[PDB]
Design an enzyme around this catalytic site. Sequence first.
Site, short mmCIF file in Angstrom:
data_model
loop_
_atom_site.label_atom_id
_atom_site.label_comp_id
_atom_site.label_asym_id
_atom_site.label_seq_id
_atom_site.Cartn_x
_atom_site.Cartn_y
_atom_site.Cartn_z
N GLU B 12 0.77 -1.24 0.00
CA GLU B 12 0.00 0.00 0.00
C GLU B 12 0.80 1.29 0.00
O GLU B 12 0.29 2.33 0.43
CB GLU B 12 -0.98 0.01 1.18
CG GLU B 12 -1.93 -1.17 1.20
CD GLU B 12 -2.84 -1.18 2.41
OE1 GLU B 12 -3.98 -0.66 2.32
OE2 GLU B 12 -2.43 -1.70 3.47
N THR B 17 -0.24 2.81 -8.21
CA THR B 17 -0.86 4.08 -8.52
C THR B 17 0.13 4.88 -9.36
O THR B 17 -0.24 5.53 -10.34
CB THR B 17 -1.21 4.85 -7.23
OG1 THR B 17 -2.10 4.04 -6.43
CG2 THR B 17 -1.89 6.18 -7.55
N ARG B 154 -8.50 0.36 -5.48
CA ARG B 154 -7.53 -0.49 -4.80
C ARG B 154 -7.58 -1.99 -5.08
O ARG B 154 -8.64 -2.61 -5.03
CB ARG B 154 -7.65 -0.26 -3.29
CG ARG B 154 -6.99 -1.32 -2.41
CD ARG B 154 -5.46 -1.31 -2.49
NE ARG B 154 -4.89 -2.35 -1.64
CZ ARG B 154 -3.61 -2.70 -1.60
NH1 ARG B 154 -2.71 -2.09 -2.37
NH2 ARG B 154 -3.22 -3.68 -0.79
N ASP B 176 6.57 -3.16 -11.69
CA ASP B 176 5.76 -3.06 -10.49
C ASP B 176 5.67 -4.46 -9.87
O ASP B 176 5.59 -5.46 -10.59
CB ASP B 176 4.38 -2.51 -10.87
CG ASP B 176 3.46 -2.30 -9.67
OD1 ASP B 176 3.97 -2.01 -8.57
OD2 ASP B 176 2.23 -2.42 -9.84
N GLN B 180 3.39 -6.50 -0.12
CA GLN B 180 3.04 -7.17 1.12
C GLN B 180 4.03 -8.33 1.27
O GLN B 180 4.54 -8.85 0.27
CB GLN B 180 1.58 -7.61 1.09
CG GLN B 180 0.66 -6.38 1.02
CD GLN B 180 -0.82 -6.70 1.17
OE1 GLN B 180 -1.31 -7.70 0.66
NE2 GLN B 180 -1.55 -5.81 1.84
N1 LIG Z 1 -4.64 10.02 -0.83
C1 LIG Z 1 -3.66 9.31 -1.41
N2 LIG Z 1 -3.91 8.00 -1.80
C2 LIG Z 1 -2.92 7.27 -2.40
C3 LIG Z 1 -1.69 7.82 -2.76
N3 LIG Z 1 -0.97 6.82 -3.37
C4 LIG Z 1 -1.72 5.74 -3.47
N4 LIG Z 1 -2.93 5.99 -2.87
C5 LIG Z 1 -4.03 5.07 -2.68
O1 LIG Z 1 -3.47 4.11 -1.73
C6 LIG Z 1 -4.06 2.82 -1.98
C7 LIG Z 1 -2.97 1.78 -2.18
O2 LIG Z 1 -2.07 2.13 -3.23
P1 LIG Z 1 -1.50 1.12 -4.26
O3 LIG Z 1 -1.03 1.87 -5.40
O4 LIG Z 1 -2.39 -0.04 -4.49
O5 LIG Z 1 -0.22 0.57 -3.42
P2 LIG Z 1 0.83 -0.58 -3.75
O6 LIG Z 1 2.16 -0.13 -3.37
O7 LIG Z 1 0.83 -0.89 -5.17
O8 LIG Z 1 0.34 -1.86 -2.88
P3 LIG Z 1 0.76 -3.40 -3.10
O9 LIG Z 1 0.55 -3.72 -4.52
O10 LIG Z 1 2.23 -3.62 -2.88
S1 LIG Z 1 -0.19 -4.32 -1.82
C8 LIG Z 1 -4.89 2.98 -3.27
O11 LIG Z 1 -6.23 3.23 -2.93
C9 LIG Z 1 -4.36 4.25 -3.92
O12 LIG Z 1 -5.22 4.96 -4.76
C10 LIG Z 1 -1.45 9.17 -2.36
O13 LIG Z 1 -0.41 9.76 -2.55
N5 LIG Z 1 -2.44 9.87 -1.68
MG LIG Z 2 0.52 -2.64 -6.39
#
Ligand SMILES: Nc1nc2c(ncn2[C@@H]2O[C@H](COP(=O)(O)OP(=O)(O)OP(O)(O)=S)[C@@H](O)[C@H]2O)c(=O)[nH]1
Ligand SMILES: [Mg+2]
Lengths: 193, 319
Positions: B12, B17, B154, B176, B180
């Site tokens: 997360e 994103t 998400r 990417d 987790q």
């Molecule tokens: N408000 C806000 N929300 C964010 C930001 N970056 C990502 N998000 C939100 O956080 C949530 C998780 O982000 P995501 O992009 O899925 O993380 P990830 O690193 O890919 O997670 P994973 O795949 O390793 S489990 C999503 O709902 C996304 O839209 C941000 O800078 N600000």
């Molecule tokens: Mg991801």
Amino acid sequence: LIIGPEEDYDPGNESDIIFQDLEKLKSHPAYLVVFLRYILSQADPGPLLFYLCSEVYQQTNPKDSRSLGKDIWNIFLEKNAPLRVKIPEMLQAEIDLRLRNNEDPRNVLCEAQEAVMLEIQEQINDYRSKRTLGLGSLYGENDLLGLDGDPLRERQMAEKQLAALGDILSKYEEDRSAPMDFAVNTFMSHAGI
Amino acid sequence: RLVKILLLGAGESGKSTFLKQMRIIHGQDFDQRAREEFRPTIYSNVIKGMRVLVDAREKLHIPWGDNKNQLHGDKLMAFDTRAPMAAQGMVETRVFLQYLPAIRALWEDSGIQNAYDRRREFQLGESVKYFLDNLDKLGVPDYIPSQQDILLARRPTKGIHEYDFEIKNVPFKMVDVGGQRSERKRWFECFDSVTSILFLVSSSEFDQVLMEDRQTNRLTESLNIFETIVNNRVFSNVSIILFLNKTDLLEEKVQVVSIKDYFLEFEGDPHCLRDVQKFLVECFRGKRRDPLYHHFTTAINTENIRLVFRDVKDTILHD
Ligand SMILES: Nc1nc2c(ncn2[C@@H]2O[C@H](COP(=O)(O)OP(=O)(O)OP(O)(O)=S)[C@@H](O)[C@H]2O)c(=O)[nH]1
Ligand SMILES: [Mg+2]
């Protein structure tokens, strides 16, 4: 408790026990090489290498250990040693004194090994935390995901991971890679790899 | 010749994103059809998210704003999140519409709102609040997710994914991966020919614990992962750039929560964004055992990412 929003998550034992004790880690060459890989990439290789070479000296006939003892000194204890290791001032002085007068250095060498064990245990605990982070595969743990409780099969795997270590030793300068190689081979060859 | 960039970070942190932003900024963007494919995920986010809220309300013993909402709470807990479609994190439109009235009523309940404010005691992403505050547009029969909606949608990442694009005759490949714990076993396969690593960190996670084991502090986990990557000699030739992401969330959080309560070594104004950001940077810099490139980002803000990646590009192309 409170339910989570993504219950589909899959988190995905003998291993842990082996990686926490240098005693049984030394008896599992395949496991030791994974740890070696971790040390060489993430930390100071001095402590572990000094310990392993010293282990060989302790297990060698006083009649065939003269030169080895000299190498250990020049490589890990000498003032300008390439892989200098930190040990109590008293012990370093005593070891030098007995080596220069051709006395039995085993007892003081053993004490130096125990001193370094403090640092080694810290490195062991650090690697265990990396395994908790789910990052064991970065250090070659997949090679253990198929071993059965058999000595020959393990020492077999040992020499294959051992050959692949060059990629990390190459990140080192000759003044350090050369003595490190000598250190590893000294233990492995005595381990039967 | 190809500039290969690897996105790393705990779960997360915003990696996927950021990847969507590259498609928006330098790629083909997302047309209406591509955006409609996110609708089922969005409806699943909302239903599962609200279910988490009512369960939390009950288990934390938070009073109902109006106990007549108990009927709606029952309807939601009765939704089977283990069924085939729901398990894949998808919800059909007709199904979503059946729960809309119940979800709308629940979101207006002060007990549910109180539960949301205490989400650090459980696990729930703030994007759920974003969609619950936009139930009117999600409820329309011909709802088509907007670009912003797609960025907030998400889904935890499994496996390795690549996206290729070009910038002024310069080819890029961005990788990417899942952050987790159980997905990190796949990282070792992604470092071949890597030019740079973009390490993402949710700057607003200091008051949270891991989803994996609701005990370890999220910031502590990010620091420990960074420590193993940045100190690995194998990546000596790879440029590492730190992104303190979710800046927007940190700005709002420092006004209601003090980082001092989670990290004693903090010595400054807990309500001051700059004081906390400086503390976060210091923490990561201190993990390196002998140049720390860093940026404060908001991955869901396209304009912010457009300018940040401009600086990242120049940094990478000059190392
Ligand atoms: N408000 C806000 N929300 C964010 C930001 N970056 C990502 N998000 C939100 O956080 C949530 C998780 O982000 P995501 O992009 O899925 O993380 P990830 O690193 O890919 O997670 P994973 O795949 O390793 S489990 C999503 O709902 C996304 O839209 C941000 O800078 N600000
Ligand atoms: Mg991801």
